[PDB]
Amino acid sequence: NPPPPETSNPNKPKRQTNQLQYLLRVVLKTLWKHQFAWPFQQPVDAVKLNLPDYYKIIKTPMDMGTIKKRLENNYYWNAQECIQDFNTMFTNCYIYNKPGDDIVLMAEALEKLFLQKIN
Ligand SMILES: COc1ccc(NC(=O)c2ccc(NC3=C(C)C(=O)CC3)c(Cl)c2)cc1
């Protein structure tokens, strides 16, 4: 497995904005507490899950645990930067998995809620 994505970086300027605070306290929190959140709460462990090809296919991994920690650490400059992480997480799931698989249907339901919350 690759190292998980960074959640802080001393060279990367930090920032707080109203939108980023909304992303943490409304958007992320509602997705995090949803029953379908669990496969998305930690970086994919391709070794433990016997998914040897996961990081062969997925070169920009992302998960809500990393997003949560980024938000809490003020890692992002702006909301768009965080939005991009969410979108990467969902697109990865759709690229890697079969349509029809539970995990895809779960991600689709989270993404629907996400889009409702950031409209
Ligand atoms: C304490 O016991 C346990 C604690 C945690 C787990 N976790 C899992 O089974 C698990 C299952 C699916 C996951 N996500 C995946 C995504 C987003 C993919 O696209 C493929 C798999 C993740 Cl990251 C973890 C098991 C036992």
For residue 58, the one-letter residue type is I
User: What would the two tokens of residue 62 be?
Assistant: 């992302």
User: Residue 31: which domain range?
Assistant: 17-119
For residue 8, tell me if it sits in a domain: no
The full DSSP string for the chain is -PPPPPS--TTSPP---HHHHHIIIIIIHHHHHSTT-GGGSS---TTTTT-TTHHHH-SS---HHHHHHHHHTT--SSHHHHHHHHHHHHHHHHHHSPTTSHHHHHHHHHHHHHHHHH-
Q: Is 40 in the pocket of ligand 1 (CB under 6 A)?
A: yes
From the list 45, 50, 43, the residue with the least C-alpha distance to 5 is 43
For residue 108, tell me if it sits in a domain: yes
Q: List, in order, residues 6 or more apart from 21 with CB less than 8 Å away.
A: none
Can you tell me the distance from the alpha carbon of 27 to that of 16, in angstroms, rounded to the nearest whole number? Answer: 16
Q: How far is the CA of 49 from the centre of ligand 1 (A)?
A: 7
Q: What atom in ligand 1 is closest to the CA of residue 96? A: 19
Resolution, given in Å to one decimal, reads 1.5
CATH number at residue 78: 1.20.920.10
Counting Cα atoms < 13 Å in the Cβ hemisphere of 50 gives 0
Give how many domains the chain has, as a whole number: 1
Q: How far is the CA of 17 from the centre of ligand 1 (A)?
A: 32
For residue 1, tell me if it sits in a domain: no
For residue 9, tell me if it sits in a domain: no
> Do the Cβ atoms of 9 and 67 come closer than 8 Å?
no
For residue 65, tell me if it sits in a domain: yes
For residue 7, tell me if it sits in a domain: no
For residue 63, tell me if it sits in a domain: yes
Structure-determination technique = X-ray
For residue 27, the one-letter residue type is V
Q: How far is the CA of 11 from the centre of ligand 1 (A)?
A: 31
For residue 21, tell me if it sits in a domain: yes
> Do the Cβ atoms of 40 and 62 come closer than 8 Å?
no
